[PDB]
Amino acid sequence: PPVPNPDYEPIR
Amino acid sequence: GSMGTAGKWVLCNYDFQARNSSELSVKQRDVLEVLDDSRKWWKVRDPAGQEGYVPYNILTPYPG
Q: Which residues pair with B54 in a beta bridge?
């Protein structure tokens, strides 16, 4: 099950 | 031109595609330079010169 919980401080 | 260490080498177990500017497009059996490893998504760089985030699930600690 790849693509875990969303990461903080994005590049957008 | 390698001035000093900061991360390590990690192999891709699986393939992925960059669906946004925050992320990258990588394939299984490739190795990438990590830069940050403190969360669910690691900051790495492709051998072509591109930086962004990839899921730690597809990354594995490569012995070099």
A: B42
Give the integer Cα–Cα distance in Å for B44 and B42: 6
* Domain boundaries of chain B, sorted by first residue: 1-64
Sign of CA dihedral B33, A12, B40, B60: negative
Contact B58, A4 (CB under 8 A): no
Looking at CA atoms only, how far is residue B2 from chain A in angstroms? 25
Whole-angstrom CA distances from B61 to B25, B32, B57 are 19, 10, 11
B1-64, what's its fold?
SH3 type barrels. (2.30.30)
**Under an 8 A CB cutoff, do A12 and B20 touch?**
yes
Inter-chain residue contact A4 with B21, CB threshold 8 Å? no
Chain B residues within 8 A of A3 when measuring between CB atoms: 55, 57
